[PDB]
Amino acid sequence: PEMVRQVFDVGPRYTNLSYIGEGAYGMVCSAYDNLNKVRVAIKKISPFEHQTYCQRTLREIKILLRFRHENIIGINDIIRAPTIEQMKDVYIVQDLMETDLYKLLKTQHLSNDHICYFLYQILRGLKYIHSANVLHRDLKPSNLLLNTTCDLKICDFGLARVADPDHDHTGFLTEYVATRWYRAPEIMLNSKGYTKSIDIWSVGCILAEMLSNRPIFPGKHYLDQLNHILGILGSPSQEDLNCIINLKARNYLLSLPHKNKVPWNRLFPNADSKALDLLDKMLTFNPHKRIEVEQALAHPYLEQYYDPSDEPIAEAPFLPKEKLKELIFEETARFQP
Ligand SMILES: *[C@H]1C[C@H](C)OC(=O)c2c(O)cc(O)cc2OCC[C@H](O)[C@H](O)C(=O)[C@@H]1F
């Protein structure tokens, strides 16, 4: 088997490997597809020792095999051993992109036209995801891939879940898995992240980061994340506080000194005014007042791209590790000769 840094056993169809980056449970390589005569991306996954890893791998495979959308990366092939006894790793083959938005923002300033086009494609993909009753729950620059002509695709459904708004309520300061800087304020107050507004907040954070090439809320631990959010949004209104019935969460907010809102055009003096208007509506403190994906697509900032007939929706909306390995084996059987 061909080896990189680690067994990367994808031959003989896929040859001439090059290291790219990292997935959750293994590395990502580029390779030559000898059948299709094009280079592809391959992610190695080794989840079978841990139950939670098998959960993350199975649910992502299930979601991506049903999804078909121009702004969501698809699974072209899945490589694994012919038997459950022999399969230790799984390889996911996907289109080879040029970069991810995290790396791009490290060194490239975006024109307003690029910001607009990137945001349009994120929301177009997100409309499809949400139309399937699915939440991505970990949107961030490193999970957005771009090709050489700036077509954008959403990657990593590792933390995705079916929406469950009737069971979203939780206590104050309960732990959360998704990446800190892109967490909506209600995660730290009273939300399990089971509603679609959790994704819109992350997109708002991504928009702000495209405007300035730096994360807008770079919190350095759990409750510090809320410090950063309130430091820019200012203190929540009485009405928004009244929507927080949990006493521990509400009294925490009531204990804070008053904070003024920082105007978006002071933070982003170069930004298009329409982009800042949409940014404000995505980074709304109250999740029930936060703009939804279809409203965001219809916002004037995105007028040159908006076309609901060309923004498709899903046709079909949505355990011991040994049973999960068996389910992963079964879910990947369609790609076997
Ligand atoms: C999803 C992982 C897929 C395999 O990533 C890619 O396809 C991919 C690509 O085609 C080109 C480049 O330059 C990077 C890349 O993935 C980078 C890894 C990414 O930031 C996350 O860690 C992922 O795993 C990704 F969402």
Domains annotated on the chain, with CATH = 1-96+319-337 (3.30.200.20), 97-318 (1.10.510.10)
- Alpha-carbon distance of 284 to 243, in angstroms, equals 14
- Alpha-carbon distance of 97 to 5, in angstroms, equals 21
Q: Please, are residues 234 and 261 in contact by the beta-carbon 8 Å criterion? A: yes
- Alpha-carbon distance of 86 to 107, in angstroms, equals 43
Q: Angle, nearest 10°, between helix axes 197-212 and 273-282? A: 150
Q: Which two tokens stand for residue 214?
A: 């730096």
> Ligand 1 centre and the CA of 265: distance in Å?
33
> Ligand 1 centre and the CA of 93: distance in Å?
11
In degrees, rounded to 5, the angle at the alpha carbon of residue 42 between the alpha carbons of residues 63 and 206 is 60
Q: Which helix (H) or strand (E) holds 197?
A: helix 197-212
Number of Cβ within 10 Å of residue 110's Cβ equals 19
Q: Which two tokens stand for residue 246?
A: 């949990």
Nearest alpha-carbon partner for 240 in 229, 259, 253, 231? 253
According to the entry, how was the structure determined? X-ray
- Alpha-carbon distance of 196 to 226, in angstroms, equals 20
- Alpha-carbon distance of 158 to 138, in angstroms, equals 8
Q: Please, are residues 265 and 273 in contact by the beta-carbon 8 Å criterion? A: yes
The SS3 assignment for 330 reads helix
């009294």: which residue's tokens? 251
Please tell me what resolution, in angstroms, this structure has. Answer: 1.7
Nearest alpha-carbon partner for 190 in 256, 248, 138? 248
Question: Of all protein residues, whose CA lies closest to atom 8 belonging to ligand 1?
Answer: 97
- What is the amino acid identity at position 171? G
Question: Of all protein residues, whose CA lies closest to atom 24 belonging to ligand 1?
Answer: 23
- Alpha-carbon distance of 63 to 158, in angstroms, equals 10
Nearest alpha-carbon partner for 86 in 325, 320, 253? 325
Question: Of the residues 77, 89, 100, 138, which is catalytic?
Answer: 138
Nearest alpha-carbon partner for 332 in 54, 12, 18, 35? 54
For the chain, the maximum distance between any two Cα atoms, rounded to a whole number of angstroms, is 65
> Ligand 1 centre and the CA of 165: distance in Å?
30
> Ligand 1 centre and the CA of 31: distance in Å?
13
The pick from 30, 100, 101 for probing ligand 1's pocket by mutation, whose C-beta has the most ligand atoms within 8 angstroms, reads 100
The pick from 145, 154, 157 for probing ligand 1's pocket by mutation, whose C-beta has the most ligand atoms within 8 angstroms, reads 145
- Alpha-carbon distance of 234 to 217, in angstroms, equals 13
Q: Please, are residues 175 and 132 in contact by the beta-carbon 8 Å criterion? A: no
Q: Which two tokens stand for residue 120?
A: 């349009």
Nearest alpha-carbon partner for 143 in 101, 181, 182? 101
Whether 224 is catalytic is no
Which residues contact ligand 1 via a Cβ below 6 A? 20-23, 28, 41, 43, 94, 96-97, 99-100, 142-143, 145, 155-156
């709304």: which residue's tokens? 284
- Alpha-carbon distance of 75 to 105, in angstroms, equals 26
β-pair type (99-100, 134-135):
unpaired
Binding-site positions: 20-28, 43
Distances (CA, A) of 139 to 5, 28, 42, 160: 29, 19, 21, 10
317: region left, alpha or beta (phi > 0 left; psi from -120 to 50 alpha)? beta
- Alpha-carbon distance of 73 to 70, in angstroms, equals 7
In terms of residues, how long is the chain? 337
Q: Please, are residues 337 and 35 in contact by the beta-carbon 8 Å criterion? A: no
Question: Of all protein residues, whose CA lies closest to atom 7 belonging to ligand 1?
Answer: 41
- Alpha-carbon distance of 213 to 311, in angstroms, equals 28
Q: Which two tokens stand for residue 262?
A: 């920082």
